[PDB]
XYZ file of N, CA, C and O in Angstrom:
412
model
N 124.189 -208.493 183.129
C 125.337 -209.237 182.626
C 125.473 -210.600 183.250
O 124.546 -211.083 183.929
N 126.623 -211.255 183.014
C 126.864 -212.581 183.534
C 128.281 -213.018 183.245
O 128.968 -212.449 182.390
N 128.736 -214.094 183.937
C 130.079 -214.577 183.715
C 130.147 -216.101 184.097
O 129.681 -216.448 185.175
N 130.738 -216.883 183.248
C 130.839 -218.295 183.487
C 131.894 -218.974 182.644
O 131.577 -219.428 181.495
N 133.124 -219.072 183.116
C 134.202 -219.708 182.368
C 135.066 -220.571 183.275
O 135.086 -220.382 184.475
N 135.783 -221.530 182.648
C 136.642 -222.416 183.425
C 138.110 -222.204 183.024
O 138.637 -222.937 182.197
N 138.748 -221.214 183.647
C 140.153 -220.917 183.336
C 140.615 -219.674 184.036
O 140.308 -218.572 183.587
N 141.411 -219.859 185.114
C 141.965 -218.711 185.824
C 143.194 -218.181 185.211
O 143.874 -218.892 184.438
N 143.511 -216.908 185.467
C 144.708 -216.293 184.900
C 145.743 -215.967 185.993
O 145.396 -215.782 187.163
N 147.017 -215.926 185.586
C 148.100 -215.633 186.490
C 148.095 -214.197 186.995
O 148.369 -213.940 188.148
N 147.766 -213.262 186.083
C 147.709 -211.868 186.402
C 146.399 -211.490 187.074
O 145.365 -212.038 186.716
N 146.435 -210.552 187.994
C 145.245 -210.103 188.682
C 144.281 -209.386 187.749
O 144.734 -208.754 186.782
N 142.979 -209.521 188.012
C 141.968 -208.890 187.184
C 141.863 -207.395 187.482
O 141.404 -207.038 188.570
N 142.275 -206.567 186.550
C 142.218 -205.147 186.737
C 140.933 -204.729 187.443
O 139.881 -204.557 186.817
N 141.023 -204.532 188.752
C 139.870 -204.145 189.566
C 139.578 -202.672 189.358
O 140.257 -201.796 189.899
N 138.537 -202.402 188.587
C 138.126 -201.041 188.328
C 136.669 -200.773 188.746
O 135.722 -201.128 188.042
N 136.533 -200.180 189.921
C 135.199 -199.872 190.468
C 135.112 -198.466 190.974
O 135.875 -198.023 191.832
N 134.156 -197.678 190.435
C 133.954 -196.305 190.819
C 132.896 -196.193 191.926
O 131.785 -196.730 191.780
N 133.255 -195.490 192.998
C 132.313 -195.283 194.101
C 131.530 -193.999 193.944
O 132.075 -192.960 193.620
N 130.202 -194.079 194.205
C 129.301 -192.917 194.103
C 129.590 -191.896 195.203
O 130.470 -192.048 195.993
N 128.751 -190.841 195.212
C 128.897 -189.768 196.177
C 127.968 -190.043 197.379
O 127.654 -189.092 198.147
N 127.585 -191.306 197.585
C 126.673 -191.669 198.656
C 127.430 -192.486 199.686
O 126.933 -192.723 200.805
N 128.652 -192.935 199.350
C 129.449 -193.734 200.252
C 130.450 -192.857 201.015
O 130.929 -191.861 200.474
N 130.772 -193.284 202.234
C 131.713 -192.545 203.054
C 133.088 -193.225 203.096
O 133.238 -194.286 203.682
N 134.070 -192.610 202.395
C 135.417 -193.188 202.343
C 136.199 -192.817 203.611
O 136.448 -191.649 203.875
N 136.585 -193.847 204.357
C 137.322 -193.639 205.594
C 138.837 -193.869 205.363
O 139.243 -194.719 204.567
N 139.669 -193.030 205.998
C 141.120 -193.127 205.874
C 141.667 -194.379 206.509
O 141.861 -194.463 207.735
N 141.987 -195.390 205.703
C 142.528 -196.660 206.147
C 143.977 -196.473 206.623
O 144.368 -196.987 207.662
N 144.780 -195.727 205.865
C 146.162 -195.498 206.187
C 146.880 -194.699 205.153
O 146.356 -193.736 204.598
N 148.085 -195.096 204.839
C 148.924 -194.432 203.856
C 150.120 -195.332 203.424
O 150.744 -195.977 204.241
N 150.355 -195.334 202.111
C 151.465 -196.132 201.556
C 152.749 -195.893 202.301
O 153.320 -194.821 202.243
N 153.178 -196.918 203.064
C 154.428 -196.824 203.818
C 155.612 -197.428 203.058
O 156.782 -197.028 203.235
N 155.293 -198.398 202.198
C 156.309 -199.067 201.427
C 155.700 -199.750 200.189
O 154.477 -199.843 200.075
N 156.564 -200.252 199.308
C 156.114 -200.934 198.091
C 156.880 -202.214 197.837
O 158.118 -202.229 197.926
N 156.186 -203.295 197.588
C 156.802 -204.584 197.322
C 157.183 -204.729 195.884
O 156.620 -204.069 195.003
N 158.148 -205.603 195.595
C 158.616 -205.841 194.229
C 157.473 -205.747 193.231
O 157.622 -205.189 192.153
N 156.306 -206.215 193.642
C 155.124 -206.154 192.774
C 153.924 -205.605 193.533
O 153.110 -204.844 192.994
N 153.807 -205.956 194.798
C 152.704 -205.505 195.648
C 153.020 -204.145 196.297
O 154.126 -203.656 196.157
N 152.075 -203.589 197.009
C 152.264 -202.294 197.675
C 151.937 -202.410 199.155
O 150.924 -203.022 199.520
N 152.767 -201.799 200.007
C 152.562 -201.835 201.456
C 151.873 -200.560 201.941
O 152.368 -199.456 201.625
N 150.776 -200.700 202.654
C 150.058 -199.537 203.189
C 149.946 -199.594 204.711
O 149.300 -200.492 205.230
N 150.545 -198.631 205.370
C 150.530 -198.573 206.844
C 149.214 -197.946 207.313
O 148.749 -196.953 206.751
N 148.651 -198.531 208.350
C 147.384 -198.010 208.905
C 147.638 -196.921 209.951
O 148.799 -196.548 210.199
N 146.564 -196.388 210.525
C 146.695 -195.306 211.502
C 145.961 -195.717 212.817
O 146.592 -196.044 213.812
N 144.639 -195.728 212.757
C 143.833 -196.072 213.924
C 142.359 -196.057 213.592
O 141.968 -195.622 212.527
N 141.552 -196.561 214.515
C 140.108 -196.614 214.320
C 139.752 -197.412 213.049
O 138.748 -197.150 212.396
N 140.614 -198.395 212.728
C 140.388 -199.193 211.534
C 139.442 -200.367 211.838
O 139.628 -201.126 212.791
N 138.419 -200.473 211.003
C 137.392 -201.557 211.125
C 137.959 -202.945 210.849
O 138.960 -203.095 210.130
N 137.322 -203.980 211.378
C 137.735 -205.353 211.159
C 137.506 -205.834 209.726
O 136.517 -206.515 209.460
N 138.387 -205.452 208.861
C 138.293 -205.870 207.465
C 139.250 -206.984 207.126
O 140.385 -206.991 207.556
N 138.747 -207.937 206.318
C 139.598 -209.064 205.908
C 140.251 -208.832 204.545
O 139.968 -207.810 203.903
N 141.025 -209.789 204.086
C 141.701 -209.683 202.773
C 140.704 -209.346 201.687
O 140.851 -208.352 200.953
N 139.636 -210.132 201.588
C 138.614 -209.924 200.580
C 138.264 -208.429 200.468
O 137.775 -207.941 199.422
N 138.495 -207.683 201.563
C 138.211 -206.257 201.577
C 138.944 -205.508 200.463
O 140.170 -205.652 200.340
N 138.224 -204.739 199.711
C 138.798 -204.003 198.612
C 139.180 -202.559 199.056
O 138.439 -201.919 199.795
N 140.379 -202.152 198.651
C 140.884 -200.849 199.044
C 140.666 -199.829 197.916
O 141.143 -200.003 196.791
N 139.865 -198.768 198.228
C 139.597 -197.728 197.236
C 140.608 -196.598 197.332
O 141.087 -196.262 198.415
N 140.933 -196.008 196.189
C 141.924 -194.938 196.115
C 141.235 -193.600 196.476
O 140.059 -193.539 196.786
N 142.058 -192.529 196.563
C 141.547 -191.225 196.928
C 140.625 -190.669 195.852
O 139.737 -189.841 196.115
N 140.815 -191.172 194.611
C 139.987 -190.696 193.490
C 138.749 -191.597 193.325
O 138.162 -191.620 192.246
N 138.431 -192.318 194.368
C 137.285 -193.187 194.375
C 137.459 -194.272 193.297
O 136.545 -194.560 192.541
N 138.646 -194.892 193.272
C 138.889 -195.936 192.281
C 139.491 -197.162 192.962
O 140.596 -197.106 193.530
N 138.782 -198.274 192.914
C 139.257 -199.529 193.504
C 140.662 -199.870 193.058
O 140.847 -200.478 192.015
N 141.659 -199.504 193.869
C 143.048 -199.778 193.543
C 143.328 -201.278 193.507
O 144.161 -201.730 192.732
N 142.585 -202.024 194.348
C 142.785 -203.481 194.364
C 142.418 -204.073 195.721
O 142.205 -203.311 196.704
N 142.335 -205.391 195.783
C 141.994 -206.085 197.014
C 143.226 -206.367 197.852
O 144.335 -206.449 197.323
N 143.046 -206.493 199.173
C 144.154 -206.757 200.045
C 144.847 -208.053 199.685
O 144.286 -209.130 199.805
N 146.099 -207.935 199.218
C 146.901 -209.101 198.835
C 147.382 -209.861 200.047
O 147.532 -211.091 200.034
N 147.638 -209.128 201.161
C 148.118 -209.704 202.385
C 148.214 -208.696 203.503
O 148.433 -207.523 203.242
N 148.023 -209.143 204.723
C 148.103 -208.256 205.900
C 149.073 -208.781 206.918
O 149.120 -209.951 207.221
N 149.914 -207.872 207.455
C 150.904 -208.257 208.457
C 151.086 -207.124 209.485
O 150.630 -206.003 209.289
N 151.758 -207.464 210.583
C 151.967 -206.474 211.620
C 151.136 -206.702 212.847
O 150.550 -207.759 213.049
N 151.090 -205.707 213.753
C 150.291 -205.819 214.992
C 148.771 -205.804 214.753
O 148.346 -206.038 213.624
N 148.037 -205.551 215.789
C 146.604 -205.539 215.706
C 146.038 -204.082 215.754
O 144.888 -203.824 215.483
N 146.950 -203.153 216.139
C 146.571 -201.741 216.222
C 147.219 -200.922 215.127
O 146.666 -199.946 214.671
N 148.416 -201.347 214.726
C 149.166 -200.646 213.672
C 149.611 -201.601 212.591
O 150.766 -201.616 212.199
N 148.673 -202.449 212.115
C 148.960 -203.433 211.073
C 149.221 -202.784 209.701
O 149.106 -201.578 209.575
N 149.568 -203.594 208.727
C 149.832 -203.107 207.387
C 149.139 -203.965 206.322
O 149.237 -205.200 206.350
N 148.452 -203.307 205.428
C 147.742 -204.004 204.391
C 148.472 -203.948 203.072
O 149.026 -202.891 202.726
N 148.499 -205.071 202.345
C 149.198 -205.128 201.077
C 148.199 -205.091 199.896
O 147.077 -205.521 200.015
N 148.652 -204.582 198.740
C 147.833 -204.513 197.552
C 148.372 -205.361 196.421
O 149.586 -205.403 196.232
N 147.470 -206.012 195.713
C 147.871 -206.914 194.610
C 148.066 -206.068 193.317
O 147.261 -205.178 193.006
N 149.131 -206.380 192.593
C 149.388 -205.710 191.315
C 150.280 -206.514 190.404
O 151.247 -207.106 190.856
N 149.938 -206.591 189.130
C 150.685 -207.379 188.158
C 152.193 -207.041 188.252
O 152.999 -207.955 188.329
N 152.515 -205.778 188.302
C 153.899 -205.321 188.407
C 153.967 -203.881 188.863
O 152.917 -203.236 189.117
N 155.176 -203.364 188.942
C 155.404 -201.977 189.355
C 154.545 -201.034 188.553
O 153.853 -200.169 189.116
N 154.578 -201.149 187.250
C 153.786 -200.291 186.351
C 152.352 -200.187 186.810
O 151.819 -199.111 187.022
N 151.709 -201.357 186.944
C 150.329 -201.415 187.390
C 150.053 -200.378 188.476
O 148.952 -199.805 188.535
N 151.054 -200.122 189.286
C 150.919 -199.170 190.372
C 151.039 -197.718 189.846
O 150.145 -196.915 190.064
N 152.165 -197.422 189.210
C 152.395 -196.111 188.667
C 151.119 -195.574 188.005
O 150.774 -194.406 188.216
N 150.451 -196.386 187.249
C 149.210 -195.985 186.561
C 148.159 -195.552 187.578
O 147.648 -194.454 187.560
N 147.787 -196.481 188.471
C 146.794 -196.235 189.502
C 147.076 -194.902 190.219
O 146.163 -194.269 190.700
N 148.368 -194.523 190.239
C 148.736 -193.283 190.895
C 149.133 -193.465 192.329
O 149.345 -192.498 193.074
N 149.212 -194.716 192.776
C 149.587 -195.059 194.142
C 151.080 -194.876 194.344
O 151.873 -195.182 193.462
N 151.459 -194.366 195.548
C 152.857 -194.168 195.862
C 153.002 -193.807 197.361
O 152.025 -193.695 198.076
N 154.255 -193.679 197.782
C 154.530 -193.352 199.179
C 153.856 -192.036 199.598
O 153.760 -191.104 198.808
N 153.379 -192.020 200.814
C 152.698 -190.840 201.334
C 151.326 -190.641 200.690
O 150.892 -189.515 200.454
N 150.713 -191.767 200.381
C 149.369 -191.708 199.740
C 148.293 -192.327 200.624
O 148.305 -193.554 200.836
N 147.422 -191.504 201.133
C 146.350 -191.946 202.032
C 145.242 -192.682 201.223
O 144.698 -192.117 200.260
N 144.928 -193.903 201.627
C 143.913 -194.686 200.947
C 142.644 -194.749 201.760
O 142.634 -194.337 202.923
N 141.590 -195.334 201.199
C 140.332 -195.462 201.936
C 139.586 -196.768 201.466
O 140.001 -197.411 200.560
N 138.520 -197.080 202.202
C 137.736 -198.268 201.878
C 136.246 -197.972 201.945
O 135.822 -196.896 202.369
N 135.434 -198.938 201.516
C 133.980 -198.756 201.475
C 133.311 -199.901 202.275
O 132.104 -200.109 202.102
């Protein structure tokens, strides 16, 4: 395939990536809160040095989205998820008390 266009969009690009059974999904944390549009995910521990560009995969091995923003301490920080709106989340199945993972 290929891609080459000159025109960005306001809404985030539905990040849909399925992870195979060869990757090890580690528990990044769990949805602690939700932003008007974005989602807040609280970490736990033993979290690797991942940057925003880092994509967060769901429990069903589905790229929920890339880190929209990170805040908090260095041991118990919180990662945010980008989403067009509340709905965008409901669909993904993300919600409070939901443990996420990364690749």
